[PDB]
Amino acid sequence: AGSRLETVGSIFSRTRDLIRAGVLKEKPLWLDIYNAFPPLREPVFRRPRLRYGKAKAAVQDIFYHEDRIRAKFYSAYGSGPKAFDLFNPNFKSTCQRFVEKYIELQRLGETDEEKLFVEAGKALLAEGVTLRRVG
C-alpha cells in the first residue's frame, strides 16, 4: 500500500523506490511535478542534536560603521525629539540625518572625532532641529 517510515528518506525517495519495486502501480500525480521541479534541499529527516563543547554558531552580527556613529549620538543626546516611524519605508530619522551629515563632513579631510561631532551638531542646529544635550 505504501511506506510510512519518516526517517528512511524523503517522500520522493520512497515513492520512486516502491514504484520501481513493483508494489505501487498507480503513479501519484505530484511525482511528475517533483521530477521536473526539485527543491533546493531534499527533505531528509535529521535529528536535531544539541551542540556541546567549543563549537559555536556561524551567524554573524550585523554591525556597520554607521552604527558606531549612532552609538555616540545616542549616548550624548539620547533619543532625538523626532518620533521614529516604522510604517514609512523611506523614513529619515534624526540620527540617520546626523550620520548622513557626519559622512559628508568627514569627506572634507577631518580626522578628529571631537571636531567631527561638534561641527555636525552645529550643522544640524543650522537646519532648525533640536539637539538638547542630555545631562
Binding site: 510510512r4 501519484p28 500525480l29 505530484w30 511535478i33 521541479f37 527543491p39 533546493l40 535529521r46 536535531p48 542534536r49 544539541l50 551542540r51 554558531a57 556561524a58 551567524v59 554573524q60 552580527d61 550585523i62
Partner: protein
C-alpha cells in the same frame, strides 16, 4: 533553531534576520509547485494552528475554492482516514 542557521542572513542586536534572497528562491519554487498541483485538479489543504489568523486563513481557502483546517487537529485524521472521515476518502495531494 539549529537547522535555520543556513537560512539566516545574520543577527541584529540579538534579533535574527532572515535572508530574503534565499526566501525568494524558495518562494519561487513553492508558488510554482503549488500552481502545478492545482492545475492537475489536486486537493490543497491549508493548515495553521494559530489563533490570530484562523478566520483570515479560513476565508482565504473559501475564495480559492480549496480546503482549510485551522481548528484542533485530531490524532488519527491523516493516518487513520477511513475511520475519521468515511469509508472511501481521497487524501489531500498537497498541504500548506
Amino acid at each position: 533553531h539549529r537547522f535555520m542557521e543556513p537560512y539566516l542572513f545574520g543577527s541584529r542586536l540579538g534579533q535574527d534576520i532572515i535572508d530574503l534572497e534565499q526566501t525568494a528562491a524558495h518562494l519561487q519554487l513553492a508558488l510554482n509547485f503549488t500552481a502545478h498541483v492545482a492545475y492537475r485538479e489536486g486537493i490543497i489543504l491549508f493548515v495553521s494552528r494559530h489563533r490570530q489568523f484562523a478566520h483570515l486563513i479560513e476565508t482565504t481557502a473559501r475564495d480559492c475554492g480549496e480546503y482549510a483546517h485551522t481548528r484542533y487537529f485530531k490524532g488519527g485524521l491523516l493516518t487513520n482516514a477511513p475511520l475519521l472521515l468515511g469509508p472511501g476518502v481521497r487524501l489531500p495531494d498537497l498541504i500548506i
